[PDB]
Every structure is written in structure tokens, then in C-alpha cells.
Amino acid sequence: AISFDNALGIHQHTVGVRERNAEVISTNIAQANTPGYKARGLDFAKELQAATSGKLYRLPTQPDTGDGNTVDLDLERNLFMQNQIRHQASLDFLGSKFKNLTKAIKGE
């Protein structure tokens, strides 16, 4: 024991995955007006597993209007804020792992 893996757990990997998820969600919003662009999704369970032990398409709710674009900006906005809250919560979890680890080694 007493290893950075055992000390931080999955919190050291969740930060990177949610940063990737924010990148994928952000490019969906930017490419919303680009015709023929298919909205791209990320599987959190699969990506987290890959990072721990060293992208899909989003089905549209309604047919596109003729540009071939399957980006629903209402869904992209909603998923972006949820990821941001979870990303902030992940940093709080990971950050306190170091602070508690520093507290033990220094005794204060």
C-alpha cells in the first residue's frame, strides 16, 4: 500500500475523462451549423475503464431539416453543464486526496 494509485483511486483518471468529454461536447456545439456533421458521443464507463487499465454517434430525437446534421443544441448545453459540475466535483475529490496525504506526512 501507500501508493499514489491506492491513494488517489479513480479520481486521478476521472479528471482527464471529463476533460475529454467537455472537448467532445464543445465541438458538437461548434459544429452544430455545419451541415452533414453527425453528433459525436463519449461512453464514460468505457473511457474510464481504458484509462484505469492502460467515440460513438448520438441518435437524433427528431429528423434533421435537410442539412444532415444531428446536433441538438438543447441536449449539448444540458450535457455540458452536468459535465462541468462533475468535473469540479472530481477536482474537489482529487484535490483533497493530496491534502489529506500531505496532512498525514506532516502531522498537521
Binding site: G36, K38, L56, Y57, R58, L59, P60, D64, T65, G66
Partner: peptide, 17 residues
């Protein structure tokens, strides 16, 4: 899904498609 969704088709006759 791992296969991109199909582009919608807006035909004026359907029969011709």
C-alpha cells in the same frame, strides 16, 4: 451507436425517392 445515423430524406414524390 457505433454506426452514424442516416441523413434524412425529404422527397417531393416518395415513389421516386
Amino acid at each position: 451507436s457505433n454506426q452514424p445515423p442516416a441523413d434524412a430524406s425529404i422527397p417531393q414524390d416518395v415513389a421516386q425517392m
